[PDB]
């Protein structure tokens, strides 16, 4: 499969999540994603084919994971935007007020701005601390997907938000949305990963 930020993948033939970013760990190929998407050794599938397994994750506390893929997968330095792509150029962290977009299998590519950092989400499983909040909308299934600036600086992977009864926060005003992401930096250093860039 061609690995691109934003596409759908399933875990153990049950749950759906979105790919965050293509990365390498030495000769091993992988993608970073949300920790709540799977447990260590869960099987990831893209378009019905096995592409790898969860190699590590932390959730709750943090919300991160990496999937090590088989050699046959093609890593790309890109994030889906409809039919087009946003190129990954690096991981400079943007500041409060910066514009940012996210990509995932349920709402597609949405943009907004960062509104706060170091936020705590009280999920049913336990608190997740240190998330950055943006007001781009997101829906059930967008978790794990990419958060990136239009300039290509990868910011993190989607964790959660204040979804309404329709499964997203897109039908409420941006001023009222809380869409949260886990910062990418600590995930790369924690797992010794390198981002694929172009």
């Amino acid at each position: 499969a061609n690995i691109v930020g934003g596409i759908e993948y399933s875990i153990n033939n049950a749950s759906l999540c979105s790919v965050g970013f293509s990365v390498t760990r030495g000769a091993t190929k992988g993608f970073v994603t949300a920790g709540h998407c799977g447990t260590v050794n869960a099987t990831a599938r893209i378009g019905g084919a096995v592409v790898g397994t969860f190699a590590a994750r932390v959730f709750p506390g943090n919300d991160r994971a990496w999937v090590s893929l088989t050699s046959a997968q093609t890593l790309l330095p890109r994030v889906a935007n409809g039919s087009s792509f946003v190129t990954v150029r690096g991981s400079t962290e943007a500041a409060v007020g910066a514009a940012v977009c996210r990509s995932g299998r349920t709402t597609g590519y949405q943009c907004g701005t960062i509104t706060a950092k170091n936020v705590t989400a009280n999920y049913a499983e336990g608190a997740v601390r240190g998330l950055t909040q943006g007001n781009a909308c997101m829906g059930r299934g967008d978790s794990g997907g990419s958060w990136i600036t239009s300039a290509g600086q990868a910011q993190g992977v989607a964790s959660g938000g204040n979804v309404q009864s329709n499964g997203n926060n897109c039908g409420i005003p941006a001023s009222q949305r809380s869409s949260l992401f886990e910062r990418l930096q600590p995930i790369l250093s924690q797992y010794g990963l390198s981002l694929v860039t172009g």
Binding site: A34, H36, F59, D63, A121, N122, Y123, A124, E125, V128, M138, G139, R140, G141, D142, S143, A158, S159, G160, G161, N162, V163, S178, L180
Partner: peptide, 4 residues
């Protein structure tokens, strides 16, 4: 908030 909920995870996703």
């Amino acid at each position: 908030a909920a995870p996703l």
